Design a protein around this ligand. Structure first.
Ligand SMILES: COC(=O)C[C@@H]1N=C(c2cccc3[nH]ccc23)c2cc(OC)ccc2-n2c(C)nnc21
Length: 108
């Protein structure tokens, strides 16, 4: 749909080199074992990341823009839940979420 094309455009922007300096933590699922975050999956019940959003978009999983937005927002919320608010990753999440929200608001 037209709205899903807008969402795909947003997705491509979030993955683009333009935003890589602060988007990179969100590219792939959090590897909790790798990062030593042995409480991550006790605190975060529904992990989400941009590669998962991209797979869902490619597989036509999302039926509308609202479903797409809920997953992107879940990704950011997981970051805000797990990490203290002064953490560098939280600053990065806030910056990427600003990119997302401002462009999502321009939905046709
Ligand atoms: C040691 O990891 C952490 O304290 C949490 C982790 N931080 C980071 C993180 C991201 C950016 C700067 C950072 N400084 C210390 C940790 C950290 C992180 C890094 C990644 O690299 C592939 C992927 C995911 C995360 N991430 C997300 C998303 N949510 N929390 C994290």
């Amino acid at each position: 749909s037209e709205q899903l094309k807008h969402c795909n455009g947003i997705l491509k922007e979030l993955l683009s080199k333009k935003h890589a300096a602060y988007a990179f933590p969100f590219y792939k699922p959090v590897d909790a074992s790798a990062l030593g975050l042995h409480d991550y999956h006790d605190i975060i019940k529904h992990p989400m990341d941009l590669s998962t959003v991209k797979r869902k978009m490619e597989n036509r999983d999302y039926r509308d823009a609202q479903e797409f937005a809920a997953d992107v927002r879940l990704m950011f919320s997981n970051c805000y839940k797990y990490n203290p608010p002064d953490h560098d990753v939280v600053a990065m999440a806030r910056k990427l979420q600003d990119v997302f929200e401002f462009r999502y608001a321009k939905m046709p």
